[PDB]
Design an enzyme around this catalytic site. Structure first.
Site, PDB file in Angstrom:
ATOM      1  N   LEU A  81      19.196 -11.162  11.308  1.00  0.00           N
ATOM      2  CA  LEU A  81      17.476 -10.940  12.235  1.00  0.00           C
ATOM      3  C   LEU A  81      17.853 -11.147  13.778  1.00  0.00           C
ATOM      4  CD1 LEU A  81      14.991 -11.426   9.766  1.00  0.00           C
ATOM      5  CD2 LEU A  81      15.509  -8.980  10.707  1.00  0.00           C
TER       6      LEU A  81
ATOM      7  N   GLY B 136       0.664  -1.406   0.070  1.00  0.00           N
ATOM      8  CA  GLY B 136      -0.067  -0.082   0.153  1.00  0.00           C
ATOM      9  C   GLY B 136       1.027   1.288  -0.148  1.00  0.00           C
ATOM     10  N   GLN B 137       0.224   2.060  -0.952  1.00  0.00           N
ATOM     11  CA  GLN B 137       0.776   3.474  -1.152  1.00  0.00           C
ATOM     12  C   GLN B 137       2.381   4.127  -0.510  1.00  0.00           C
ATOM     13  OE1 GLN B 137      -1.349   6.619  -2.512  1.00  0.00           O
ATOM     14  NE2 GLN B 137      -0.040   8.203  -1.708  1.00  0.00           N
TER      15      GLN B 137
ATOM     16  N   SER C 130       1.525   1.519   6.019  1.00  0.00           N
ATOM     17  CA  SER C 130       1.141   2.560   6.749  1.00  0.00           C
ATOM     18  C   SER C 130       0.187   2.243   7.925  1.00  0.00           C
ATOM     19  CB  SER C 130      -0.092   3.615   5.675  1.00  0.00           C
ATOM     20  OG  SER C 130       0.341   2.929   4.577  1.00  0.00           O
TER      21      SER C 130
ATOM     22  N   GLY D  19      -4.941   4.053   6.721  1.00  0.00           N
ATOM     23  CA  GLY D  19      -4.994   3.919   5.699  1.00  0.00           C
ATOM     24  C   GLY D  19      -5.430   2.827   5.003  1.00  0.00           C
TER      25      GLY D  19
ATOM     26  N   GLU E 160      -8.514   7.233  10.380  1.00  0.00           N
ATOM     27  CA  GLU E 160      -7.477   6.758  10.717  1.00  0.00           C
ATOM     28  C   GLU E 160      -7.493   6.392  12.216  1.00  0.00           C
ATOM     29  OE1 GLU E 160      -5.769   7.090   7.247  1.00  0.00           O
ATOM     30  OE2 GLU E 160      -4.363   8.560   7.943  1.00  0.00           O
TER      31      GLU E 160
ATOM     32  N   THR F 224      -5.345  -0.640   2.817  1.00  0.00           N
ATOM     33  CA  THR F 224      -4.730  -1.835   2.829  1.00  0.00           C
ATOM     34  C   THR F 224      -4.123  -1.521   3.341  1.00  0.00           C
ATOM     35  OG1 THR F 224      -3.239  -1.992   0.623  1.00  0.00           O
ATOM     36  CG2 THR F 224      -4.812  -0.739   0.043  1.00  0.00           C
TER      37      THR F 224
ATOM     38  N   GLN G 100       5.604   3.549  -1.924  1.00  0.00           N
ATOM     39  CA  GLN G 100       6.523   4.925  -1.754  1.00  0.00           C
ATOM     40  C   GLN G 100       7.977   5.164  -1.139  1.00  0.00           C
ATOM     41  OE1 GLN G 100       3.899   7.599  -2.251  1.00  0.00           O
ATOM     42  NE2 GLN G 100       3.940   8.152  -4.228  1.00  0.00           N
TER      43      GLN G 100
ATOM     44  N   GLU H  57      19.249 -12.379  16.617  1.00  0.00           N
ATOM     45  CA  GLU H  57      20.590 -11.977  17.514  1.00  0.00           C
ATOM     46  C   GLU H  57      20.097  -9.754  16.527  1.00  0.00           C
ATOM     47  OE1 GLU H  57      24.159 -12.326  17.108  1.00  0.00           O
ATOM     48  OE2 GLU H  57      23.438 -14.364  17.405  1.00  0.00           O
TER      49      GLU H  57
HETATM   50  N1  LIG Z   1       5.769   8.918   5.467  1.00  0.00           N
HETATM   51  C1  LIG Z   1       5.278   8.709   4.161  1.00  0.00           C
HETATM   52  N2  LIG Z   1       3.235   8.178   4.780  1.00  0.00           N
HETATM   53  C2  LIG Z   1       2.472   8.560   3.576  1.00  0.00           C
HETATM   54  C3  LIG Z   1       3.447   8.576   2.026  1.00  0.00           C
HETATM   55  N3  LIG Z   1       1.820   7.900   1.364  1.00  0.00           N
HETATM   56  C4  LIG Z   1       0.588   7.896   2.355  1.00  0.00           C
HETATM   57  N4  LIG Z   1       1.618   8.499   3.610  1.00  0.00           N
HETATM   58  C5  LIG Z   1       0.708   8.357   5.002  1.00  0.00           C
HETATM   59  O1  LIG Z   1       0.092   7.120   5.003  1.00  0.00           O
HETATM   60  C6  LIG Z   1      -0.908   7.347   6.002  1.00  0.00           C
HETATM   61  C7  LIG Z   1      -2.153   6.682   4.960  1.00  0.00           C
HETATM   62  O2  LIG Z   1      -1.448   5.151   4.436  1.00  0.00           O
HETATM   63  P1  LIG Z   1      -1.844   4.881   2.784  1.00  0.00           P
HETATM   64  O3  LIG Z   1      -0.491   4.679   1.825  1.00  0.00           O
HETATM   65  O4  LIG Z   1      -2.684   6.296   1.619  1.00  0.00           O
HETATM   66  O5  LIG Z   1      -3.337   3.974   2.338  1.00  0.00           O
HETATM   67  P2  LIG Z   1      -2.858   2.712   1.605  1.00  0.00           P
HETATM   68  O6  LIG Z   1      -4.572   1.859   1.080  1.00  0.00           O
HETATM   69  O7  LIG Z   1      -2.068   1.625   2.011  1.00  0.00           O
HETATM   70  O8  LIG Z   1      -3.087   3.117   0.012  1.00  0.00           O
HETATM   71  P3  LIG Z   1      -4.511   4.058  -1.150  1.00  0.00           P
HETATM   72  O9  LIG Z   1      -4.804   2.339  -1.452  1.00  0.00           O
HETATM   73  O10 LIG Z   1      -4.172   4.894  -1.931  1.00  0.00           O
HETATM   74  O11 LIG Z   1      -5.772   4.261  -0.384  1.00  0.00           O
HETATM   75  C8  LIG Z   1      -1.517   8.316   6.349  1.00  0.00           C
HETATM   76  O12 LIG Z   1      -0.500   8.121   7.637  1.00  0.00           O
HETATM   77  C9  LIG Z   1      -0.488   8.769   5.360  1.00  0.00           C
HETATM   78  O13 LIG Z   1       0.001  10.278   5.601  1.00  0.00           O
HETATM   79  C10 LIG Z   1       4.451   7.831   1.960  1.00  0.00           C
HETATM   80  O14 LIG Z   1       4.804   8.703   0.565  1.00  0.00           O
HETATM   81  N5  LIG Z   1       5.420   8.587   2.657  1.00  0.00           N
HETATM   82 MG   LIG Z   2      -6.337   2.939   0.871  1.00  0.00          MG
END
Ligand SMILES: Nc1nc2c(ncn2[C@@H]2O[C@H](COP(=O)(O)OP(=O)(O)OP(=O)(O)O)[C@@H](O)[C@H]2O)c(=O)[nH]1
Ligand SMILES: [Mg+2]
Ligand SMILES: Nc1ncnc2c1ncn2[C@@H]1O[C@H](COP(=O)(O)OP(=O)(O)NP(=O)(O)O)[C@@H](O)[C@H]1O
Ligand SMILES: COc1cc2c(c(OC)c1OC)-c1ccc(OC)c(=O)cc1[C@@H](NC(=O)CS)CC2
Ligand SMILES: Nc1nc2c(ncn2[C@@H]2O[C@H](COP(=O)(O)OP(=O)(O)O)[C@@H](O)[C@H]2O)c(=O)[nH]1
Ligand SMILES: [Mg+2]
Lengths: 419, 301, 421
Positions: free
Chosen positions: C241, C9-10, C129, C132, C172, C134, C14, C243
């Site tokens: 891991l 997930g996002q 995450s 968020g 959240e 997924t 990233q 240790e």
């Molecule tokens: N540090 C950091 N936080 C992120 C990033 N992208 C999203 N977030 C944070 O991640 C949380 C939301 O998670 P998402 O990645 O958007 O949720 P997801 O379901 O996994 O992804 P989606 O399917 O796009 O909804 C919030 O806390 C955001 O601030 C990132 O690239 N870096």
């Molecule tokens: Mg999502």
């Protein structure tokens, strides 16, 4: 009459490797070749530490054990690498451990037989076998766990002969693992049961000697081994050399250990680093110069054995040796009569014109056991990293059973500061 | 801590060999050893030595009399929630097994039985009725640092000790008894498969339990002769026993003292030591050894 | 031996996108393909290429699509990039049940396709995450199932704790509590990263008025690099891991260590004693809170670059003289120090400069529970009115699972506080 030497696990292997090359040059032996050196003595009891093979050649009666190649090939491509008999090396290949369990049960047992079967060859080759001596570390596992096993299996096949070990007890400073206390305690228990004498080489003591009294900043595993290695030659001298004592190594046992519970010796050396006699004794009886983190003050000596070295007059030695247990005559248990014996030999060690070494069965050693049992019950409290062993097959109460045995050993040593 | 001595009479064999009886017990606390000696010039004389015990029994004392002044006073201790131990100590053939297990054979005539008999009598007394206790029995022997269940066919058991240091004997079989005849059946069974002659330590136990908890425990011990280098284990255990008992009124461990550890550490614990003596002139050195060991034990009272 | 990375997930994706790039730069692998030790994380595929041991999963393409677009496109296999058309919707209930179920079997099987060319795997590093869609949902489900297919093998999670400003979602806090419950009995050790703490460090240090994700991730990248590093280089700090964790977590309750990065300083030499000194400084943490309050029950120092222990020692000595030591009752005074001679390489157009030496410090304090509170309050207060619960009941969840999860967070917060003296 004749002894075999097992040497297992990274520390042990490294420690012993220096021992070997150190006595070898004492006796005048080449990386393979035989004698070379205008001395003549050497060869009398060369028998004791060297089974000799084809042609001249001398090859030490040594067995090399480990659970990972590396450390072994460190020796082969090293000091006196060519000296040891090829199929005397016993590789491990698999995971090391640095966890007792692995070495005393799973990955350990796996090898045991193939080593045991090679000690069996060396032993049965011996004209009259005296016993075995093994070097290993109590912390970590490829020798603290396989080692304590190897010995549990030597007795049984050799109740007869005696068990001797040089074991490096580990410390919080200069350590690779958080678990050492677990590994340590687990072995200490084993040693108590199946060995006749054990020398304690404390690494805490060791580090202290290099930096606290030798200006040596970063203490390598190197200049540190140099201490142990020199000490070990001092401790064996009388069995490998003259015609003063002879040293049945059993005589040494029967005379140094008053009580069954194999009592652990703290060793000490005279001059050091990589000497008037009164100056030599004053030093060899100093805490600041013991090989174990203790301090004979906070405890009496059960029995002491000292062995000098180099051309010097015994007239002075016997005099100074009486003068120690006088200016300090309160620290020598008075329920055991002439409990401090001194031996002199006239073949100087490396460099050194004069030298002395010391073996001490002192109730102060209690101090050492207490401090490892301190970090043990301090972790096994809220069952720490324990799941690493539970997993390899061990039971929870095999820890309490070890801890319990160990504290008694403290409660016994502390019982003999009697009257 | 209570220490007693019991002289057994000369047996047939000894009388036949014309063994001289060199033991006298002129009072209920005094035992005399008429030690035969020779001066340098070969002149015969007696060095008559005197020992005093809480109770000294002569050759006419029966097991019931001995029991009355040794283990009987300890039964109450377990009902009061304590831990009691009674040891029979002395040379081979001095009367240890005869006293604890029955004449020889006959379980009922021994201390194990008699003690059991009083345990059932006390549990049915008003002061204890409301305790709702259950009586359990165990019988095991210690041989060369090894524990063997005598009520579970010499089955070898494991002894473990955590860090807190209490000991536990894994697998020891506890049998429920509701009658003295029950206890006598377990004693016969156990004695029938014991390793007569010493070589081991015999230990018959009487435990009191109420609800998951141990109320009290009485350990009756038939020690091995105090006089093949297993004598080292026997001597270490005896040396260990002495220091454990003395530590009670105030090591170099062994199996025996490890297993009975919890019976010396508590504040509500009592022990009685009975020193058996063979009256024959030929056993005089063994006797003196037994008596001096006894002296040091009571020395802590 | 080996080591699989999973990014779900996002945020997960990233973050990894940015630390797989710092990895390459560290080991010098020209995006395209090629240049053991380096083998812990890569599988020498083909007679050229170097490829990661990773899997990326998201329930919508978008994010993953940019990966198969920008350079690094060649770097992975097409299979290790799983994508799912329909979104997670922003509610655990969807990711863990409804929408997940459909893609779990395909992920689960591919990660096993990766673990198959690994003679004696070690464990998984999972990035996701906290709140968020997924990130909370699918993750939780993955971990449940990973535990079924991989008994022993450890699971190390890298979680992103959400913070008001670097935009969250109203729901959240529900999601966070929710996942962290199921997920807890299945992880071995987890590294929490507060988005407020990183937003914060980018302000006081990099001096960016509006910190981007791409700005935050870069920094997180570094923290992660320094964490793994040890087991990538290899013979240095926290090897294999086990240790690693055997060093931080004293209690099965998955303990979340507190991470503190050394010198963060913008482009356009700091003393060994100084960076250590900056490690015991709240303003430089990874989870906003403060341990001058709670206690420490295991400290770790992970150095990188030009450093001799001789100093590391004298830096520790003075770091205790005029400071808040506050170690906990029954636990030594840790300090498993690890030095990794290999210098800290940073991204080329990055905002941070090359640095002579950097520290890491991973501590398991009781004060990290101050974050478990800040979340509970939000959750507790919304749940006080079933605020949005109906969306979860909608996908097929029980109102009970909401109780049953907060119920654990009530417990955890107790345990944490219970470890105090
Ligand atoms: N540090 C950091 N936080 C992120 C990033 N992208 C999203 N977030 C944070 O991640 C949380 C939301 O998670 P998402 O990645 O958007 O949720 P997801 O379901 O996994 O992804 P989606 O399917 O796009 O909804 C919030 O806390 C955001 O601030 C990132 O690239 N870096
Ligand atoms: Mg999502
Ligand atoms: N008070 C006593 N009266 C009559 N016979 C006795 C008495 N005490 C012991 N005996 C007998 O003498 C022998 C010693 O018995 P026990 O079998 O009692 O010895 P220990 O148990 O003293 N010997 P050991 O097992 O070798 O250490 C047996 O044959 C007993 O029946
Ligand atoms: C139609 O496109 C919109 C879509 C959404 C939002 C929104 O309002 C700003 C929209 O504009 C009308 C949205 C909404 C609501 C929130 O709570 C009030 C939230 O936290 C968050 C959001 C939007 N997301 C974010 O701000 C994620 S950092 C996503 C859902
Ligand atoms: N002095 C001495 N001690 C050592 C040496 N190597 C390790 N040690 C100590 O011994 C302990 C375990 O040694 P190690 O060889 O790694 O264990 P192994 O896996 O059994 O071989 C460590 O915790 C160190 O304190 C050595 O080279 N010499
Ligand atoms: Mg008998």
């Amino acid at each position: 009459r004749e002894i075999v030497h097992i040497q297992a696990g990274q520390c042990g292997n490294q420690i012993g490797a220096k021992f070997w090359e150190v006595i070898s040059d004492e006796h005048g032996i080449d990386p393979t070749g035989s004698y070379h050196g205008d001395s003549d003595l050497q060869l009398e009891r060369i028998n004791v530490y060297y089974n000799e093979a084809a042609g001249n050649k001398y090859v030490p009666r040594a067995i090399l054990v480990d659970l990972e190649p590396g450390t072994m090939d460190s020796v082969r491509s090293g000091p006196f690498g060519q000296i040891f008999r090829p199929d005397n090396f016993v590789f491990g290949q698999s995971g090391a451990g640095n966890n007792w369990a692995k070495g005393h049960y799973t990955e350990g047992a796996e090898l045991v037989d193939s080593v045991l079967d090679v000690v069996r060859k060396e032993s049965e080759s011996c004209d009259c076998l005296q016993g075995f001596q093994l070097t290993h570390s109590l912390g970590g596992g490829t020798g603290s766990g396989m080692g304590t096993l190897l010995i549990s299996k030597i007795r049984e096949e050799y109740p007869d002969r005696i068990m001797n070990t040089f074991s490096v007890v580990p410390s919080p400073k200069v350590s690779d693992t958080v678990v050492e206390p677990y590994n340590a305690t687990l072995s200490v228990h084993q040693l108590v049961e199946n060995t006749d004498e054990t020398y304690c080489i404390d690494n805490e003591a060791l580090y202290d000697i290099c930096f606290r009294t030798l200006k040596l900043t970063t203490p390598t595993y190197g200049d540190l081994n140099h201490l142990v290695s020199a000490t070990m030659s001092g401790v064996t001298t009388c069995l490998r050399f003259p015609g003063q004592l002879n040293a049945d190594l059993r005589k040494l046992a029967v005379n140094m250990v008053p009580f069954p519970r194999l009592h652990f010796f703290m060793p000490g050396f005279a001059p050091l680093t990589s000497l008037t006699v009164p100056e030599l004794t004053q030093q060899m009886f100093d805490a600041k110069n013991m090989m174990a983190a203790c301090d004979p003050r906070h405890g009496r000596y059960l029995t002491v054995a000292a062995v000098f070295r180099g051309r010097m007059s015994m007239k002075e030695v016997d005099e100074q040796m009486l003068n120690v247990q006088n200016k300090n005559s309160s620290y020598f248990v008075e329920w055991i009569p002439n409990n401090v014996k001194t031996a002199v030999c006239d073949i100087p060690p490396r460099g050194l014109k004069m030298s002395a070494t010391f073996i001490g069965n002192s109730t102060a050693i209690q101090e050492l056991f207490k401090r490892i049992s301190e970090q043990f019950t301090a972790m096994f409290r809220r069952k720490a990293f324990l799941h690493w062993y539970t997993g390899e097959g061990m039971d929870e109460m095999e820890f309490t059973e070890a801890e319990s045995n160990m504290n008694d050993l403290v409660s016994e040593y502390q019982q003999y500061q009697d009257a | 801590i209570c220490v007693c001595v019991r002289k057994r009479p000369l047996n047939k064999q000894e009388l036949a060999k014309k063994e001289i009886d060199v033991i006298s017990v002129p009072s209920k606390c005094l035992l005399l050893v008429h030690e035969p000696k020779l001066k340098v010039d070969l002149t015969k004389y007696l060095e008559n030595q005197a020992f005093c015990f809480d109770f000294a029994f002569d050759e006419t004392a029966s097991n019931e009399v001995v029991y009355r002044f040794t283990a009987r006073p300890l039964v109450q201790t377990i009902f009061e929630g304590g831990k009691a131990t009674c040891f029979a100590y002395g040379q081979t053939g001095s009367g240890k097994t005869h006293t604890m297990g029955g004449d020889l054979q006959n379980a009922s005539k021994g201390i194990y039985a008699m003690a059991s008999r009083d345990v059932f009598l006390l549990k049915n007394q008003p002061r204890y009725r409301n305790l709702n206790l259950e009586v359990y029995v165990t019988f095991f022997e210690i041989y060369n640092g090894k524990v063997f269940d005598l009520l579970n066919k010499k089955a070898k058991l494991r002894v473990l000790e955590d860090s807190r240091q209490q000991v536990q004997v894994v697998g020891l079989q506890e049998y429920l008894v509701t009658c003295a005849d029950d206890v006598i059946k377990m004693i016969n069974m156990g004695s029938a498969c014991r390793t007569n002659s010493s070589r081991s330590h015999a230990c018959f136990q009487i435990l009191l339990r109420t609800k998951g908890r141990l109320h009290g425990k009485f350990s009756l011990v038939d020690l091995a002769g105090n006089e093949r280098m297993e004598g080292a284990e026997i001597n270490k255990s005896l040396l260990a026993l002495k220091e454990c008992i003395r530590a009670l009124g105030q090591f170099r461990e062994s199996k025996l003292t490890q297993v009975l550890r919890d019976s010396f550490i508590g504040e509500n614990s009592r022990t009685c030591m009975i020193a058996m003596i063979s009256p024959g002139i030929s056993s005089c050195e063994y006797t003196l050894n037994t008596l001096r060991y006894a002296d040091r034990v009571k020395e802590l009272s | 031996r080996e080591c699989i990375s999973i990014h779900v997930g996002q945020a997960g994706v990233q973050i990894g996108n940015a630390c797989w790039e710092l990895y390459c730069l560290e080991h010098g692998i020209q995006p395209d393909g090629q240049m053991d030790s380096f083998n812990t994380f890569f599988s020498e595929t083909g007679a050229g290429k170097h490829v990661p041991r990773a899997v990326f999963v998201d329930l919508e393409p978008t994010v993953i699509d940019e990966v198969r677009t920008g350079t690094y496109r060649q770097l992975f296999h097409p299979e290790q990039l799983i994508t799912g058309k329909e979104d997670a919707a922003n509610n655990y209930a969807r990711g863990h049940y409804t929408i997940g179920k459909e893609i779990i079997d395909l992920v689960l099987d591919r990660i096993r396709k990766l673990a198959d060319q690994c003679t004696g795997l070690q464990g998984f590093s999972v990035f996701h995450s906290f709140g968020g869609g997924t990130g909370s949902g699918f993750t939780s489900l993955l971990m449940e199932r990973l535990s079924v297919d991989y008994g022993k093998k450890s699971k190390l999670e890298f979680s992103i704790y959400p913070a008001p400003q670097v935009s969250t979602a109203v729901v959240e806090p529900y999601n966070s509590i929710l996942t962290t419950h199921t997920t807890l009995e299945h992880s071995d050790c987890a590294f929490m990263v507060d988005n407020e703490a990183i937003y914060d460090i980018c302000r006081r240090n990099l001096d960016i008025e509006r910190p981007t994700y791409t700005n935050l991730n870069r920094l997180i990248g570094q923290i992660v690099s320094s964490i793994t590093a040890s087991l990538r280089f290899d013979g240095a700090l926290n090897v294999d891991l086990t240790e690693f964790q055997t060093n931080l977590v004293p209690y099965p309750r998955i303990h979340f260590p507190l991470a503190t990065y050394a010198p963060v300083i913008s482009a356009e030499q700091l003393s060994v004693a100084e960076i250590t000194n900056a490690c015991f400084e709240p303003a430089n943490q990874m989870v906003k809170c403060d341990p001058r309050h709670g206690k420490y029950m295991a400290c770790c120092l992970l150095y990188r670059g030009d450093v001799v222990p001789k100093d590391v020692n004298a830096a520790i000595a003075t770091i205790k003289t005029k400071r808040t030591i506050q170690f906990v009752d029954w636990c030594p005074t840790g300090f498993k120090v690890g030095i990794n001679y290999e210098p800290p390489t940073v991204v080329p157009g990055g905002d941070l400069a090359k640095v002579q030496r950097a520290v890491c410090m991973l501590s398991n304090t009781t004060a990290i529970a101050e974050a478990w509170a800040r979340l509970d309050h939000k959750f507790d207060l919304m749940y006080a009115k079933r605020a949005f619960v109906h969306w979860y009941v909608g996908e097929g969840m029980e109102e009970g699972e909401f109780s049953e999860a907060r119920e654990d967070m009530a417990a955890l917060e107790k345990d944490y506080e219970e470890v105090g003296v």
